[PDB]
Amino acid sequence: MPEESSPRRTPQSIPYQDLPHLVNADGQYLFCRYWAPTGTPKALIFVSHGAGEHSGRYEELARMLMGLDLLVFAHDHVGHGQSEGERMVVSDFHVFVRDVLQHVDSMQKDYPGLPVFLLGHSMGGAIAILTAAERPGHFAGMVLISPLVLANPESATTFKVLAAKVLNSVLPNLSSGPIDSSVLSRNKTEVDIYNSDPLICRAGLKVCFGIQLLNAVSRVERALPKLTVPFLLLQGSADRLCDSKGAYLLMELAKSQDKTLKIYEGAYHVLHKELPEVTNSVFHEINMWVSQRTA
Numbered sequence: 001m002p003e004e005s006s007p008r009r010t011p012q013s014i015p016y017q018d019l020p021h022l023v024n025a026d027g028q029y030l031f032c033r034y035w036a037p038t039g040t041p042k043a044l045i046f047v048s049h050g051a052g053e054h055s056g057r058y059e060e061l062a063r064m065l066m067g068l069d070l071l072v073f074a075h076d077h078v079g080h081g082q083s084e085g086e087r088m089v090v091s092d093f094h095v096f097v098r099d100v101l102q103h104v105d106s107m108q109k110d111y112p113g114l115p116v117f118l119l120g121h122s123m124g125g126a127i128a129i130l131t132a133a134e135r136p137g138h139f140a141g142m143v144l145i146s147p148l149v150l151a152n153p154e155s156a157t158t159f160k161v162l163a164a165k166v167l168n169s170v171l172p173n174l175s176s177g178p179i180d181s182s183v184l185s186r187n188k189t190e191v192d193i194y195n196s197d198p199l200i201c202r203a204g205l206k207v208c209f210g211i212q213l214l215n216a217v218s219r220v221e222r223a224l225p226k227l228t229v230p231f232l233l234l235q236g237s238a239d240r241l242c243d244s245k246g247a248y249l250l251m252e253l254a255k256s257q258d259k260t261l262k263i264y265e266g267a268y269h270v271l272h273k274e275l276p277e278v279t280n281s282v283f284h285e286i287n288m289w290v291s292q293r294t295a
Ligand SMILES: O=C1CO[C@@H]2CCN(C(=O)N3CCC(Cc4ccc(C(F)(F)F)cc4)CC3)C[C@H]2N1
Pocket: 049, 050, 051, 052, 053, 057, 121, 122, 123, 124, 148, 151, 152, 155, 156, 157, 159, 160, 179, 184, 194, 205, 210, 211, 213, 214, 215, 217, 241, 242, 270, 273
Protein backbone atom coordinates (compact mmCIF):
# COMPACT_ATOMS: atom_id res chain seq x y z
CA MET A 1 0.00 0.00 0.00
CA PRO A 2 1.41 3.43 -0.98
CA GLU A 3 1.75 6.01 1.80
CA GLU A 4 1.44 9.78 1.87
CA SER A 5 4.80 11.63 1.96
CA SER A 6 5.85 13.68 5.07
CA PRO A 7 3.72 16.84 5.49
CA ARG A 8 4.88 19.97 3.60
CA ARG A 9 6.52 22.36 6.09
CA THR A 10 7.49 26.02 6.20
CA PRO A 11 11.19 26.97 5.92
CA GLN A 12 11.03 27.07 9.79
CA SER A 13 9.84 23.37 9.82
CA ILE A 14 6.18 24.00 10.83
CA PRO A 15 3.65 21.80 8.93
CA TYR A 16 1.45 23.94 6.62
CA GLN A 17 -1.51 21.76 7.79
CA ASP A 18 -1.23 23.60 11.18
CA LEU A 19 -1.28 27.11 9.61
CA PRO A 20 -3.56 29.20 7.37
CA HIS A 21 -2.21 28.77 3.85
CA LEU A 22 -2.78 28.97 0.12
CA VAL A 23 -1.07 27.02 -2.72
CA ASN A 24 -0.05 29.33 -5.58
CA ALA A 25 -0.09 28.60 -9.38
CA ASP A 26 3.49 27.26 -9.15
CA GLY A 27 2.50 24.71 -6.45
CA GLN A 28 4.21 26.75 -3.67
CA TYR A 29 2.65 27.14 -0.22
CA LEU A 30 2.09 30.69 0.96
CA PHE A 31 1.56 31.34 4.66
CA CYS A 32 -1.60 33.45 5.28
CA ARG A 33 -2.89 35.78 8.01
CA TYR A 34 -6.44 36.95 8.76
CA TRP A 35 -7.85 39.59 11.12
CA ALA A 36 -11.67 39.48 10.94
CA PRO A 37 -14.17 41.56 12.94
CA THR A 38 -16.99 39.98 15.01
CA GLY A 39 -19.71 41.48 12.77
CA THR A 40 -20.32 41.45 9.01
CA PRO A 41 -17.30 43.13 7.36
CA LYS A 42 -17.85 46.47 5.62
CA ALA A 43 -14.95 45.74 3.22
CA LEU A 44 -11.88 43.51 2.65
CA ILE A 45 -8.28 44.77 2.67
CA PHE A 46 -5.14 42.94 1.53
CA VAL A 47 -1.86 43.92 3.20
CA SER A 48 1.26 43.61 0.96
CA HIS A 49 4.60 43.54 2.85
CA GLY A 50 7.99 44.67 1.54
CA ALA A 51 11.26 43.03 0.53
CA GLY A 52 12.96 40.81 3.08
CA GLU A 53 10.19 41.19 5.66
CA HIS A 54 6.86 39.35 6.22
CA SER A 55 3.17 39.82 7.14
CA GLY A 56 3.70 39.50 10.91
CA ARG A 57 5.09 43.05 10.97
CA TYR A 58 1.59 44.43 10.14
CA GLU A 59 -0.11 43.23 13.35
CA GLU A 60 -0.87 46.70 14.80
CA LEU A 61 -1.97 48.23 11.47
CA ALA A 62 -4.20 45.19 10.78
CA ARG A 63 -5.78 45.34 14.24
CA MET A 64 -6.60 49.06 13.68
CA LEU A 65 -8.19 48.17 10.31
CA MET A 66 -10.14 45.27 11.81
CA GLY A 67 -11.37 47.74 14.48
CA LEU A 68 -13.02 49.68 11.60
CA ASP A 69 -14.98 46.48 10.65
CA LEU A 70 -12.74 45.58 7.70
CA LEU A 71 -11.63 41.99 7.18
CA VAL A 72 -7.82 42.24 6.84
CA PHE A 73 -5.90 39.49 5.06
CA ALA A 74 -2.30 38.96 4.01
CA HIS A 75 0.22 36.36 2.95
CA ASP A 76 4.01 36.20 3.02
CA HIS A 77 5.19 36.71 -0.57
CA VAL A 78 7.07 33.79 -2.18
CA GLY A 79 10.66 33.57 -0.87
CA HIS A 80 9.64 35.48 2.29
CA GLY A 81 8.77 34.77 5.91
CA GLN A 82 6.85 31.52 6.42
CA SER A 83 6.08 30.96 2.71
CA GLU A 84 7.97 28.54 0.48
CA GLY A 85 10.62 29.45 -2.10
CA GLU A 86 14.38 30.18 -2.14
CA ARG A 87 14.90 33.26 0.09
CA MET A 88 14.56 36.52 -1.82
CA VAL A 89 14.33 34.89 -5.22
CA VAL A 90 11.44 35.31 -7.70
CA SER A 91 11.23 33.92 -11.26
CA ASP A 92 9.51 37.13 -12.40
CA PHE A 93 8.18 40.06 -10.35
CA HIS A 94 4.68 39.29 -11.75
CA VAL A 95 4.56 36.14 -9.52
CA PHE A 96 3.93 38.48 -6.54
CA VAL A 97 1.06 40.21 -8.38
CA ARG A 98 -0.43 36.91 -9.61
CA ASP A 99 -0.39 35.53 -6.02
CA VAL A 100 -2.06 38.67 -4.51
CA LEU A 101 -4.79 38.33 -7.18
CA GLN A 102 -5.31 34.64 -6.38
CA HIS A 103 -5.74 35.43 -2.67
CA VAL A 104 -8.06 38.41 -3.37
CA ASP A 105 -10.16 36.25 -5.76
CA SER A 106 -10.39 33.48 -3.16
CA MET A 107 -11.53 35.92 -0.44
CA GLN A 108 -14.11 37.56 -2.71
CA LYS A 109 -15.70 34.11 -3.22
CA ASP A 110 -16.12 33.71 0.59
CA TYR A 111 -17.26 37.34 1.10
CA PRO A 112 -19.08 38.35 -2.10
CA GLY A 113 -20.29 41.88 -2.83
CA LEU A 114 -17.72 43.52 -0.54
CA PRO A 115 -15.40 46.31 -1.67
CA VAL A 116 -11.71 45.37 -1.65
CA PHE A 117 -8.79 47.67 -0.74
CA LEU A 118 -5.01 47.21 -0.97
CA LEU A 119 -2.38 48.39 1.48
CA GLY A 120 1.26 48.12 0.45
CA HIS A 121 4.60 49.26 1.85
CA SER A 122 7.83 49.63 -0.21
CA MET A 123 8.18 46.60 -2.62
CA GLY A 124 4.66 45.68 -1.41
CA GLY A 125 3.49 49.13 -2.64
CA ALA A 126 4.92 48.40 -6.13
CA ILE A 127 3.03 45.07 -5.99
CA ALA A 128 -0.20 46.91 -4.93
CA ILE A 129 0.17 49.43 -7.82
CA LEU A 130 0.73 46.67 -10.40
CA THR A 131 -2.21 44.66 -8.93
CA ALA A 132 -4.59 47.64 -9.20
CA ALA A 133 -3.31 48.49 -12.71
CA GLU A 134 -4.00 44.92 -13.91
CA ARG A 135 -7.66 45.17 -12.75
CA PRO A 136 -8.88 48.75 -13.42
CA GLY A 137 -12.09 49.54 -11.54
CA HIS A 138 -11.91 46.42 -9.35
CA PHE A 139 -10.35 47.86 -6.19
CA ALA A 140 -12.07 50.44 -3.97
CA GLY A 141 -8.80 52.07 -2.92
CA MET A 142 -5.14 51.67 -2.23
CA VAL A 143 -3.04 52.86 0.75
CA LEU A 144 0.69 53.16 -0.12
CA ILE A 145 3.34 53.60 2.55
CA SER A 146 6.69 54.63 0.95
CA PRO A 147 5.98 52.57 -2.21
CA LEU A 148 8.81 51.54 -4.49
CA VAL A 149 8.23 53.89 -7.45
CA LEU A 150 11.76 55.27 -7.90
CA ALA A 151 14.75 53.66 -6.19
CA ASN A 152 17.49 55.81 -4.51
CA PRO A 153 19.52 57.15 -7.50
CA GLU A 154 22.81 55.62 -6.27
CA SER A 155 21.18 52.21 -5.73
CA ALA A 156 19.53 52.35 -9.18
CA THR A 157 23.02 52.83 -10.75
CA THR A 158 24.50 49.98 -8.63
CA PHE A 159 21.84 47.47 -9.74
CA LYS A 160 21.85 48.59 -13.41
CA VAL A 161 25.62 47.85 -13.52
CA LEU A 162 25.25 44.52 -11.67
CA ALA A 163 22.32 43.45 -13.91
CA ALA A 164 24.49 44.16 -16.97
CA LYS A 165 27.30 41.94 -15.54
CA VAL A 166 24.96 38.95 -14.88
CA LEU A 167 23.03 39.57 -18.16
CA ASN A 168 26.39 39.17 -19.98
CA SER A 169 27.92 36.37 -17.84
CA VAL A 170 26.88 33.41 -15.55
CA LEU A 171 27.23 34.52 -11.90
CA PRO A 172 24.47 32.92 -9.77
CA ASN A 173 25.80 33.97 -6.34
CA LEU A 174 26.45 37.67 -7.17
CA SER A 175 24.87 39.98 -4.60
CA SER A 176 25.00 43.61 -3.48
CA GLY A 177 25.48 44.62 0.20
CA PRO A 178 22.60 44.33 2.69
CA ILE A 179 20.05 47.12 3.33
CA ASP A 180 21.57 49.48 5.98
CA SER A 181 19.10 49.03 8.89
CA SER A 182 19.88 52.51 10.32
CA VAL A 183 18.08 54.19 7.36
CA LEU A 184 14.82 52.29 8.02
CA SER A 185 13.54 54.48 10.81
CA ARG A 186 14.60 57.19 13.24
CA ASN A 187 12.95 54.97 15.92
CA LYS A 188 15.98 53.05 17.20
CA THR A 189 13.80 50.43 18.96
CA GLU A 190 12.14 49.55 15.60
CA VAL A 191 15.61 49.28 13.96
CA ASP A 192 16.63 46.89 16.78
CA ILE A 193 13.39 44.86 16.36
CA TYR A 194 14.06 44.54 12.60
CA ASN A 195 17.60 43.32 13.38
CA SER A 196 16.23 40.72 15.88
CA ASP A 197 13.40 39.14 13.86
CA PRO A 198 14.47 35.68 12.60
CA LEU A 199 11.77 35.82 9.87
CA ILE A 200 13.43 38.82 8.21
CA CYS A 201 16.06 38.21 5.55
CA ARG A 202 18.87 40.67 6.13
CA ALA A 203 21.33 39.17 3.60
CA GLY A 204 22.62 41.22 0.64
CA LEU A 205 20.21 41.47 -2.28
CA LYS A 206 20.99 38.86 -4.95
CA VAL A 207 21.55 40.44 -8.39
CA CYS A 208 18.74 38.28 -9.92
CA PHE A 209 16.33 39.75 -7.29
CA GLY A 210 17.72 43.26 -8.00
CA ILE A 211 16.82 42.70 -11.71
CA GLN A 212 13.23 41.93 -10.69
CA LEU A 213 13.14 45.15 -8.61
CA LEU A 214 14.38 47.05 -11.72
CA ASN A 215 11.54 45.29 -13.62
CA ALA A 216 9.08 46.41 -10.92
CA VAL A 217 10.21 50.08 -11.20
CA SER A 218 9.93 49.97 -15.03
CA ARG A 219 6.50 48.28 -14.90
CA VAL A 220 5.23 50.75 -12.26
CA GLU A 221 6.25 53.67 -14.52
CA ARG A 222 4.36 52.16 -17.49
CA ALA A 223 1.32 51.41 -15.28
CA LEU A 224 0.82 54.94 -13.90
CA PRO A 225 -1.30 56.29 -16.87
CA LYS A 226 -3.49 53.15 -16.44
CA LEU A 227 -3.89 53.67 -12.67
CA THR A 228 -7.33 55.05 -11.80
CA VAL A 229 -7.85 53.54 -8.32
CA PRO A 230 -8.35 55.98 -5.41
CA PHE A 231 -5.18 56.17 -3.29
CA LEU A 232 -3.56 57.63 -0.19
CA LEU A 233 0.22 57.99 -0.50
CA LEU A 234 2.37 58.49 2.62
CA GLN A 235 6.07 59.31 2.15
CA GLY A 236 8.99 60.44 4.35
CA SER A 237 11.12 63.28 3.02
CA ALA A 238 14.40 61.66 4.18
CA ASP A 239 13.73 58.19 2.74
CA ARG A 240 17.04 56.70 1.51
CA LEU A 241 15.38 53.51 0.12
CA CYS A 242 12.36 54.74 -1.90
CA ASP A 243 13.20 58.15 -3.21
CA SER A 244 10.58 60.77 -2.35
CA LYS A 245 10.75 61.92 -6.04
CA GLY A 246 8.85 58.67 -6.81
CA ALA A 247 5.93 59.74 -4.60
CA TYR A 248 5.71 63.10 -6.47
CA LEU A 249 5.92 61.21 -9.82
CA LEU A 250 3.05 58.92 -8.76
CA MET A 251 0.88 61.96 -7.78
CA GLU A 252 1.62 63.58 -11.11
CA LEU A 253 1.32 60.65 -13.53
CA ALA A 254 -1.53 58.51 -12.05
CA LYS A 255 -4.90 59.15 -13.71
CA SER A 256 -6.79 58.58 -10.40
CA GLN A 257 -9.50 61.17 -9.70
CA ASP A 258 -9.00 60.58 -5.92
CA LYS A 259 -5.34 60.94 -4.96
CA THR A 260 -3.79 62.35 -1.79
CA LEU A 261 -0.15 62.71 -0.72
CA LYS A 262 1.07 63.30 2.83
CA ILE A 263 4.78 64.08 3.29
CA TYR A 264 6.43 63.45 6.69
CA GLU A 265 9.23 65.98 7.05
CA GLY A 266 12.48 64.33 8.09
CA ALA A 267 10.98 60.83 8.37
CA TYR A 268 12.78 57.75 7.13
CA HIS A 269 11.40 54.74 5.17
CA VAL A 270 9.24 52.65 7.51
CA LEU A 271 6.59 55.25 8.35
CA HIS A 272 4.35 52.89 10.29
CA LYS A 273 7.37 52.06 12.59
CA GLU A 274 8.86 55.57 12.84
CA LEU A 275 8.98 58.05 15.76
CA PRO A 276 5.65 57.95 17.72
CA GLU A 277 4.53 61.36 16.40
CA VAL A 278 4.87 60.05 12.83
CA THR A 279 3.47 56.54 13.47
CA ASN A 280 0.43 57.90 15.36
CA SER A 281 -0.30 60.26 12.44
CA VAL A 282 0.16 57.46 9.86
CA PHE A 283 -2.36 55.24 11.71
CA HIS A 284 -4.80 58.17 12.14
CA GLU A 285 -4.60 59.19 8.43
CA ILE A 286 -5.14 55.65 7.16
CA ASN A 287 -8.04 55.21 9.63
CA MET A 288 -9.73 58.45 8.36
CA TRP A 289 -9.07 57.69 4.68
CA VAL A 290 -10.47 54.13 4.80
CA SER A 291 -13.35 55.19 7.13
CA GLN A 292 -14.39 57.90 4.62
CA ARG A 293 -14.38 55.33 1.77
CA THR A 294 -16.24 52.51 3.66
CA ALA A 295 -19.09 54.61 5.25
O1 LIG B 1 9.47 47.21 7.57
C1 LIG B 1 10.36 47.11 6.73
C2 LIG B 1 11.72 46.55 7.09
O2 LIG B 1 12.77 47.00 6.22
C3 LIG B 1 12.48 46.75 4.84
C4 LIG B 1 13.64 46.97 3.89
C5 LIG B 1 13.25 46.63 2.46
N1 LIG B 1 11.97 47.25 2.07
C6 LIG B 1 11.66 47.19 0.72
O3 LIG B 1 10.64 46.67 0.27
N2 LIG B 1 12.54 47.83 -0.10
C7 LIG B 1 12.48 47.57 -1.54
C8 LIG B 1 13.88 47.50 -2.14
C9 LIG B 1 14.69 48.76 -1.83
C10 LIG B 1 16.12 48.67 -2.38
C11 LIG B 1 16.20 48.65 -3.89
C12 LIG B 1 17.14 47.87 -4.54
C13 LIG B 1 17.17 47.80 -5.92
C14 LIG B 1 16.27 48.53 -6.68
C15 LIG B 1 16.43 48.61 -8.16
F1 LIG B 1 17.22 49.62 -8.53
F2 LIG B 1 16.96 47.50 -8.67
F3 LIG B 1 15.28 48.79 -8.79
C16 LIG B 1 15.32 49.29 -6.03
C17 LIG B 1 15.30 49.37 -4.65
C18 LIG B 1 14.68 49.02 -0.33
C19 LIG B 1 13.25 49.08 0.21
C20 LIG B 1 10.87 47.08 3.03
C21 LIG B 1 11.27 47.59 4.42
N3 LIG B 1 10.23 47.53 5.47
